[PDB]
Amino acid sequence: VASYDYLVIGGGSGGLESAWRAAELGARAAVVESHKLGGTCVNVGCVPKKVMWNTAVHSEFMHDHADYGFPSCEGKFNWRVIKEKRDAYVSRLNAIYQNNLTKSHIEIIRGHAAFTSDPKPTIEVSGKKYTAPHILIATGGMPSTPHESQIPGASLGITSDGFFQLEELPGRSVIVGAGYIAVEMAGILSALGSKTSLMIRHDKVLRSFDSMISTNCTEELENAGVEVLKFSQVKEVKKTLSGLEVSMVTAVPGRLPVMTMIPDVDCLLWAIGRVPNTKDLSLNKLGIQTDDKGHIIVDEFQNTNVKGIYAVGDVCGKALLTPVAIAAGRKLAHRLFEYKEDSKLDYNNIPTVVFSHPPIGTVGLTEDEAIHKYGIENVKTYSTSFTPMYHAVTKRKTKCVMKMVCANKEEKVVGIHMQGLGCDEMLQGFAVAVKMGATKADFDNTVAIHPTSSEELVTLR
Amino acid sequence: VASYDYLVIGGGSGGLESAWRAAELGARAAVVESHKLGGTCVNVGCVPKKVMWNTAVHSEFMHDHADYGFPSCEGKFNWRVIKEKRDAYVSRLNAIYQNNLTKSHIEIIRGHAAFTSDPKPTIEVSGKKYTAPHILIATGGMPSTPHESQIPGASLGITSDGFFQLEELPGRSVIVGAGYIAVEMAGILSALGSKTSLMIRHDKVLRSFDSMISTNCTEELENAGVEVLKFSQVKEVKKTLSGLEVSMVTAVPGRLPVMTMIPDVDCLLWAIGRVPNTKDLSLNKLGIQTDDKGHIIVDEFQNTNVKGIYAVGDVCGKALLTPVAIAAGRKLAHRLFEYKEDSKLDYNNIPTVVFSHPPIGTVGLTEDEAIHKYGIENVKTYSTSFTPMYHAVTKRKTKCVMKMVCANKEEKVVGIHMQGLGCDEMLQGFAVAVKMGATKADFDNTVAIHPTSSEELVTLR
Ligand SMILES: Cc1cc2nc3c(=O)[nH]c(=O)nc-3n(C[C@H](O)[C@H](O)[C@H](O)COP(=O)(O)OP(=O)(O)OC[C@H]3O[C@@H](n4cnc5c(N)ncnc54)[C@H](O)[C@@H]3O)c2cc1C
Ligand SMILES: Cc1cc2nc3c(=O)[nH]c(=O)nc-3n(C[C@H](O)[C@H](O)[C@H](O)COP(=O)(O)OP(=O)(O)OC[C@H]3O[C@@H](n4cnc5c(N)ncnc54)[C@H](O)[C@@H]3O)c2cc1C
Ligand SMILES: N[C@@H](CCC(=O)N[C@H]1CSSC[C@H](NC(=O)CC[C@H](N)C(=O)O)C(=O)NCC(=O)NCCCNCCCCNC(=O)CNC1=O)C(=O)O
Ligand SMILES: N[C@@H](CCC(=O)N[C@H]1CSSC[C@H](NC(=O)CC[C@H](N)C(=O)O)C(=O)NCC(=O)NCCCNCCCCNC(=O)CNC1=O)C(=O)O
DSSP states (O other), X not given: OEXXXXXXXXXXXXXXXXXXXXXXXXXXXXXXXXXXXXXXXXXXXXXXXXXXXXXXXXXXXXXXXXXXXXXXXXOOOOHHHHHHHHHHHHHHXXXXXXXXXXXXXXXEEESOOOBOSOSSOEEEETTEEEEOSOEEEOOOEEEOOOOTTTSTTGGGSBOHHHHTTOSSOOSEEEEEOOSHHHHHHHHHHHHTTOEEEEEOSSSOSSTTSOHHHHXXXXXXXXXXXXXXXXXXXXEEEEEOSSSEEEEEEEOOTTSOOEEEEEEEESEEEEOSOEEESOGGGTGGGTXXXXXXXXXXXXXXXXXXXXXXXXXXXXXXXXXXXXXXXXXXXXXXXXXXXXXOTTOOOOOSSOXXXXXXXXXXXXXXXXXXXXXXXXXXXXXXXXXXXXXXXXXXXXXXXXXXXXXXXXXXXXXXXXXXXXXSTTHHHHHHHHHHXXXXXXXXXXXXXXXXXXXXXXXXXXXXX | OEEOSEEEEOOSXXXXXXXXXXXXXXXXXXEEESSOTTHHHHHHSHHHHHHHHHHHHHHHHHTTTGGGTSOOOOOOOOHHHHHHHHHHHHHXXXXXXXXXXHHTTOEEEESOOOBOSOSSOEEEETTEEEEXXXXXXXOOEEEOOOOTTTSTTGGGSBOHHHHTTOSXXXXXXXXXXXXXXXXXXXXXXXXXXXXXXXXXXXXXXXXXXXXXXXXXXXXXXXXXXXXXXXXXXXXXXXXXXXXXXXXXXXXXXXXXXXXXXXXXXXXXXXXXXXXXXXXXXXXXXXXXXXXXXXXXXXXXXOBOXXXXXXXXXXXXXXXXXXXXXXXXXXXXXXXXHSOOTTOOOOOSSXXXXXXXXXXXXXXXXXXXXXXXXXXXXXXEEEEEEEOOGGGGSOSSOOOEEEEEEEETTTTEEEEEEEESTTHHHHHHHHHHHHHHTOBHHHHHTSOOOSSOSGGGGTTOO
């Protein structure tokens, strides 16, 4: 058995950062990677999505061309051109990552890890055993998919991965889900041409986002060409000769259920969830506890119930984002290897941007969460709704909405929620202020930048 | 003589805000406006510029169309279409402003004010006299133009105003100046098609901006098609039959001066400066002191040397921006009418964005200013330079550069300087943090938003 100081299972966002931080502090680590380095984000997440989103934003603006004094462009978009480019970028990123690892003296055990029966924690990668006084499970998660048992014909559809493997823009797309992935897949496909349908269980999407957002977003979708199928469910999927035939059920409360066929569907995309990547780890050999869905259970310091084993990222189920994974593995290394007894990530005021059209950005508490925490009496919220001046000359229109949630008498800014043009780059700073403890006064005592959409946040009233 | 509580001379950015604030606090004010309400910003500044900039950004992205899988568009841009639209927007804004005033019970004395001989401060608007225990001069400024005396043929060229009156994109443009206006006029014209030349007195532009910016910006200009004529000066301008003929002098230090003719110039734009709008006020009747250039002299509370007279905005010469004008008139009203003895605007950490391509955004001290204030020993600066992932698939390329200036041992973030895609919407938040007193630690303890250009600011190292 080879002994290292750190043995990180999983070369994705959290895995790598924790190993990098560790090696830079003097330790000897080894990332065990079973597939391609970079994890879900580089290979089938953040990176590919953004490229496709940038592209979607491009067809959009093409529509305001004439309005800006230029001749129109018909627009026969060629899927494969941007696909092949996107995939290249991904290769370049892989190489770059491999290099950085080796550059930092990080051994890469190339294969699939699983814990052994051995008393002291140990893992076996391809018939070989490795161990270390510190092992970090950072194996992430994967797409949740329905059962033929539950939904007959479920396996006929694809997921976000399958999406990133498509070599042709499907003519008829149907997406099932109401979260950021479902919302983004719906936006890219329909902006790029596909006749998209977003099948949601309720009346709106991003339901766990501040009411205003959940509302605005369901609307901008409709306004843009996405068909939101509310209170609908996929009963069964069938492969016809002309595509797929989806049997759906619309149970609009107050009305009688109605069965519907969506025929000639080219792409059926399941965007219902991410299940943890933990069973093939043989967690049961050590008794590393998990929840009923397989998520690995950890304390505020990412400690499993076993000594010398920790967990970070998607695998734990909390705050499924690359920066949260990174930030947790970075603080862990310091904890362990720099002896900082308290470096733990703070899970409050985490910023998130959803790349829908226009983009959403949000940090902090929703109004309801503020309310349930402070009490109606101690929660003031400021809002605004305007038309970016980009649309001052376009027939096409999107709007921008911003809401500030304030707590107590000082009006501590506990939550920022907005959707609109530029909201993607706009969030990070206010997130810093929101993280430092900013109050409304501080925001109002900042000279504005005119003309910009961001200036509307420091002049609310 | 009609007496009010507040008598504001000038209905622009600072004028209006101060009057609005005052009327909302119970006072009776009257904006004296000599032309169109909204001032320079609405009529010939912020508003028209941004529309033209949005347009310029549109021809730009048209170039990356094919690279994103779409067919190309030749691009015969029609100037007048966007011109007429831009002008309409401006009318709509005027109406909206007029309304707001009257809606807030603000009397609009429509004409040209000038102080009278009268002992107590008083002004005469069209043979009629008005007075008040508080008069605010907020008459702004105007384009500086060379003398036939100095530069023979100077009056042959136009300024930023003349620019906003052009009904046709000049084929050959020559811009003279090295500041944000000169830089923007150069960027809009050349992005929109005109064969532009930027005539600067030195080797770079935005010379008073952090070295990195001054440098990067001179480069992105060249890289984009703008011909930067360094160490050059306009000797004399002459009207030929084929356009204008500019006699220039290039005195590159270390070399011998060389005379040059730029012939067939369609547009000669003077972007050398803004002179104050004060002589027709008859300031001398009261002895309201000014500087040698006519700027009105005020204390930290915008107090002139006379009691009951104040000054705000461009007229004073300090921080020539709409938000600074606004912010000063807003704090003044409170001071005066809400009896807040100390509401004064803080002139440090003022944010500014220059709409060049890519956009610049900057707040706080430059490295040199940090240095001269703290000492080389106590100033650490972090930098980064990357390619936005928008260009991961485009042949065209622009880069993004960010520099953080830190002071003392805590590394108080005293200055943020960046240029790149999205830097326009990106600044406001960090400006708030920079204004609250953020240190590098605070920035590094903020979870990032991936993927974005703004995330690079909270992960510097
Ligand atoms: C579509 C889509 C879009 C997304 N968009 C964004 C975005 O824009 N920004 C950011 O929000 N986040 C985004 N995410 C989320 C982000 O991708 C994840 O939250 C992040 O990737 C998780 O980090 P992690 O370290 O836990 O996991 P992961 O990066 O998923 O990595 C786990 C790695 O370990 C490997 N592995 C697994 N088991 C073993 C084993 N037993 N032995 C060896 N190796 C093993 C895996 O193969 C993989 O390479 C997106 C996800 C999807 C899916
Ligand atoms: C091109 C160009 C681009 C700019 N871009 C930006 C930008 O993007 N953002 C922001 O940066 N700032 C911008 N500015 C600067 C901004 O326009 C000014 O700094 C702001 O307009 C100044 O406010 P102010 O109240 O002092 O003056 P002003 O708005 O200039 O207003 C003075 C008003 O008073 C009137 N007046 C003058 N004398 C009298 C009199 N005696 N009696 C009655 N009325 C009188 C004037 O006619 C005018 O209507 C720009 C300027 C130019 C020129
Ligand atoms: N900020 C976004 C949203 C659009 C926007 O900025 N609109 C401005 C552009 S006009 S360009 C003129 C410029 N406006 C600004 O700086 C706008 C920013 C902020 N809302 C404010 O309070 O000023 C100014 O000089 N203000 C001084 C003053 O007297 N201001 C008096 C108080 C504001 N008017 C009340 C708000 C609705 C009026 N909108 C309107 O009148 C219509 N539009 C506006 O006020 C963007 O840039 O796209
Ligand atoms: N942020 C800008 C700039 C471009 C960018 O974000 N590039 C990222 C996209 S790759 S998508 C993968 C994602 N990257 C990010 O989150 C990048 C953000 C920050 N620089 C960081 O420290 O991570 C991640 O999962 N990181 C975890 C980790 O192990 N990280 C180890 C430390 C970072 N690598 C060192 C910096 C150069 C490597 N660049 C590279 O490798 C090439 N590119 C990158 O790292 C944008 O979004 O356009």
